[PDB]
C-alpha cells in the first residue's frame, strides 16, 4: 500500500507538461501561423499535430481517466476570450488555472462533467476565429479516449464530438471565403475522427447511414477542398466499402480524376493497397502486381503494427495467380511470420505442381482463408496447376507420352492433350509441338528476339518524365 500510494504522484507530471504544451505550442503556434503566411498553408504545425496525435496514439494518450488533471478539458475549451487583445488575458488565465490546479485537487476526475464542458465553447460565443482550435480542444480529450473501449455512456460523448465535427463540416461548406488555410488542417483532423466515426460505429454494426453522410461530405468537398480531403475520404470510403458490398470497383472509375496530388505520403500507397485489392478483383495481373507492390514498397517507416505486414501478405496473391512465385520464408518477420503461417505452405504449394499438395493446403488452412477473406481464387488455382504443371513437364521432358504426363495433369486424355498445350500458347506458355497418334508430346523451342524495344523506348519517357517531376519539386521548393 505505501509503495503503490506513493507511486501515484510521479506519473501525472509528464502529461501535466507535454500534454499541456502539445496543443498549447502547436495549437497556439498555429494561431500565429494562421494569422499570416499563409504560404499557403504551412501551417507546419498541422504536420506537427500529426506527430503529436501519433505520439499520443501509443503513450500515454490522455483519457480514459488516469485520475490525473482532468481539468485540461475545460482549460482550452473555454475562455477564447474573445477578441485577440482580450484573448491575451485568457492566455494568462491558463497560467491562472495552472496555479489553481497547483493548489487544490485540480479536478482529477471529469466523467459526466463533459456535458457542460463540451458545451462551454458554445457558451462563450465565440472563439470565434479558428474553428480548428475549437474542434481540436474538444476532440483531443475525446479522440484518444476512444482507445479505452469502455462502451458505457461515453460513446454518445464521442458522438457529440462527431456533432461538433459536423458543425466543423457545415463551416467546411461555407467559409471559405476565401483561402481557408485552416481547412487543410481540418482535412487532417477530421479524417482522424472520420476514422473514429468508423471505429465508434463499428462498435455495433456497419456505418451505412454514414456512407450516405460520407458521400455527402466527399461530394460537397468537390471540387474546392478535395485536395488532401478527397484522398483521405476516399480511403474512408474504400476501407469499409471493401468490407460491405457493393459497386465500388466501378464507382472509383467515375470518381477519378486520380485524385491528385497524392497526400499525405503513405496515404496514396495504402490507397493503392485498398484499390489494389479492388483492381485485383478484375484479376488483370500486371496492374494488380504493380499496384500491390507499389502499395507496400511506398510505405515507410512503421511501426505499428501488422497491417503494413498485411499489405505484403495479400501482395503476392496475384503473383500466385501469375504461375511463378519465389519462396518467401526468408522475408518472415517476428510478427508477420506467426500471422501468415498457413499462407507459407500455401505459396509453397503454389511453387510445386502437385495437386494434392495444394488441395490439402486448402482443406487444412481454409480457416485462415476465412480470416484473410480471399477464397474464390483458391479453387481456380487448380488451373494454374495444370498450366504450370504442363509448363513444367513440357519444357522439362524431351518427348512425354500423354499417358505418363497424365498422372500430374490428372486427366491428359488422348484428346485434351492437344488443347492443354495449344490453349497454353493462347496464354503464352510453351511452344511444344505434338503429333498425336499414341501419342507423345515432343517439346522444342526456337526463339531469338525482343528483350529490346519497349524497355529502352519506355525508359526514355520514364527517366525524362521523372526528372521533369523532380524539376517540378526542386524548382518549387526554393521559396525559402
Amino acid at each position: 500500500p505505501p509503495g503503490g500510494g506513493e507511486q501515484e504522484p510521479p506519473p501525472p507530471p509528464a502529461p501535466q507538461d507535454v500534454e499541456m504544451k502539445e496543443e498549447a505550442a502547436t495549437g497556439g503556434g498555429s494561431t500565429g501561423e494562421a494569422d499570416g503566411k499563409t504560404a499557403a498553408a504551412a501551417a507546419e504545425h498541422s504536420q506537427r499535430e500529426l506527430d503529436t496525435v501519433t505520439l499520443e496514439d501509443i503513450k500515454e494518450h490522455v483519457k480514459q481517466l488516469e485520475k490525473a488533471v482532468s481539468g485540461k478539458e475545460p482549460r482550452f475549451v473555454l475562455r477564447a476570450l474573445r477578441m485577440l487583445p482580450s484573448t491575451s488575458r485568457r492566455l494568462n488565465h491558463y497560467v491562472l488555472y495552472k496555479a489553481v490546479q497547483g493548489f487544490f485537487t485540480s479536478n482529477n476526475a471529469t466523467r459526466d462533467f463533459l456535458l457542460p464542458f463540451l458545451e462551454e465553447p458554445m457558451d462563450t460565443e465565440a472563439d470565434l476565429q479558428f474553428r480548428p482550435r475549437t474542434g481540436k480542444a474538444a476532440s483531443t480529450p475525446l479522440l484518444p479516449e476512444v482507445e479505452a473501449y469502455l462502451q458505457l455512456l461515453v460513446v454518445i460523448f464521442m458522438m457529440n464530438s462527431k456533432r461538433y465535427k459536423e458543425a466543423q463540416k457545415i463551416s467546411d461548406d461555407l467559409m471559405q471565403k476565401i483561402s481557408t488555410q485552416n481547412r487543410r488542417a481540418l482535412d487532417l483532423v477530421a479524417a482522424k475522427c472520420y476514422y473514429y466515426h468508423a471505429r465508434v460505429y463499428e462498435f455495433l454494426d456497419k456505418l451505412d447511414v454514414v456512407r450516405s453522410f460520407l458521400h455527402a461530405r466527399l461530394r460537397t468537398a468537390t471540387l474546392r477542398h478535395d485536395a488532401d480531403g478527397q484522398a483521405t475520404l476516399l480511403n474512408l470510403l474504400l476501407r469499409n466499402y471493401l468490407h460491405y458490398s457493393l459497386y465500388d470497383q466501378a464507382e472509383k472509375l467515375v470518381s477519378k480524376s486520380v485524385f491528385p496530388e497524392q497526400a499525405n505520403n503513405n496515404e496514396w500507397a495504402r490507397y493503392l493497397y485498398y484499390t489494389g485489392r479492388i483492381k485485383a478483383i478484375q484479376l488483370e495481373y500486371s496492374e494488380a502486381r504493380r499496384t500491390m507492390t507499389n502499395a507496400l514498397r511506398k510505405a515507410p517507416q512503421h511501426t505499428a503494427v501488422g497491417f503494413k505486414q498485411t499489405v505484403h501478405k495479400l501482395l503476392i496473391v496475384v503473383e500466385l495467380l501469375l504461375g511463378e512465385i519465389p519462396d518467401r520464408l526468408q522475408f518472415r518477420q517476428p510478427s508477420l511470420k506467426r500471422s501468415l503461417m498457413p499462407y507459407f505452405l500455401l505459396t509453397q504449394a503454389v511453387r510445386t505442381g502437385n495437386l494434392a499438395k495444394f488441395n490439402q493446403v486448402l482443406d487444412q488452412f481454409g480457416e485462415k482463408f476465412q480470416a484473410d477473406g480471399t477464397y474464390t481464387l483458391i479453387i481456380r488455382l487448380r488451373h494454374n496447376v495444370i498450366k504450370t504443371g504442363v509448363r513444367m513437364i513440357s519444357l522439362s521432358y524431351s518427348r512425354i507420352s500423354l499417358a505418363d504426363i497424365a498422372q500430374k495433369l490428372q486427366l491428359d486424355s488422348p484428346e485434351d492433350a492437344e488443347f492443354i498445350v495449344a490453349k497454353a500458347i493462347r496464354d503464352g506458355v510453351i511452344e511444344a509441338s505434338i503429333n498425336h497418334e499414341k501419342g507423345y508430346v515432343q517439346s522444342k523451342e526456337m526463339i531469338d528476339i525482343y528483350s529490346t524495344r519497349e524497355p529502352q523506348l519506355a525508359f526514355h519517357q520514364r527517366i525524362s518524365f521523372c526528372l521533369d517531376i523532380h524539376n517540378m519539386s526542386v524548382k518549387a521548393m526554393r521559396f525559402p
Binding site: 450516405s212 455527402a216 461530394r219 460537397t220 459497386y247 470518381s255
Partner: protein, 183 residues
C-alpha cells in the same frame, strides 16, 4: 441498378423509377453511369411527360461523374421542374457553369457584332435574372454590379443601375473597377 425498370413500356414505372432515384441515389450516384444511355430513351421521348425529371437525375449522375457542360445541356432540357428546386449544393456549380458559358457566349456574340448570333435558350438566361432577384432583394450592390459586368449586355445592366435606394455616386467608382479590369 434501378434503371432496369425503364425497359417496361408504360410511363408509370418510369415515374416510380425516378421516385427511387431522387432518394437513395446517394450511394447510387455511380450506379446510373453505364445506364445513362438508357436514360436517353426517356430524354429523347417527347410523349413522356417526366422527361424533365429524367434530365434532373441524369444531371445528378453526370454531376457525380464530373460532367459539367453536359449537365448544363440536360439542365436546358430539364424543363421547369429543374430551376424550381435547389438544395444541398447542386446550385453553385451549375450556376457557375451557366453564367460562365452564358457570359462567354455573350462575349462570343459581342464580337460579331450583329447578326448570325447563336441561339440562346430562354431557361439559361431565365435563371440569370431570376437568380439575380437574390441580388435585387438582398440589396447587395457589390455582387449585383459584379454579375452586371459578367453578362456583357446593356439591358439587364440598365436594370442594375436602375435598382432602388442609392448608390448615389457608386456608378463612378464602379466604372473605376470596370476600367481597371476592362479588356
Amino acid at each position: 441498378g434501378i434503371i432496369s425498370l425503364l425497359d417496361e413500356d408504360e410511363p408509370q414505372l418510369k415515374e416510380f423509377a425516378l421516385h427511387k432515384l431522387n432518394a437513395v441515389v446517394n450511394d447510387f450516384w455511380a450506379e446510373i453511369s453505364e445506364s445513362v444511355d438508357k436514360i436517353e430513351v426517356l430524354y429523347e421521348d417527347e410523349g413522356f411527360r417526366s422527361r424533365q425529371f429524367a434530365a434532373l437525375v441524369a444531371s445528378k449522375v453526370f454531376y457525380h461523374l464530373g460532367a459539367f457542360e453536359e449537365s448544363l445541356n440536360y439542365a436546358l432540357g430539364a424543363g421547369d421542374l429543374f430551376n424550381v428546386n435547389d438544395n444541398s449544393e447542386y446550385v453553385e456549380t451549375i450556376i457557375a457553369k451557366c453564367i460562365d458559358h452564358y457570359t462567354k457566349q455573350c462575349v462570343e456574340n459581342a464580337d460579331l457584332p450583329e447578326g448570325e448570333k447563336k441561339p440562346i435558350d430562354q431557361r439559361l438566361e431565365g435563371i440569370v435574372n431570376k437568380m439575380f432577384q437574390r441580388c435585387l432583394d438582398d440589396h447587395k450592390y457589390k455582387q449585383a454590379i459584379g454579375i452586371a459586368l459578367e453578362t456583357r449586355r446593356l439591358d439587364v445592366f440598365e436594370k442594375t443601375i436602375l435598382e432602388s435606394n442609392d448608390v448615389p455616386g457608386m456608378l463612378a467608382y464602379s466604372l473605376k473597377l470596370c476600367m481597371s479590369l476592362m479588356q
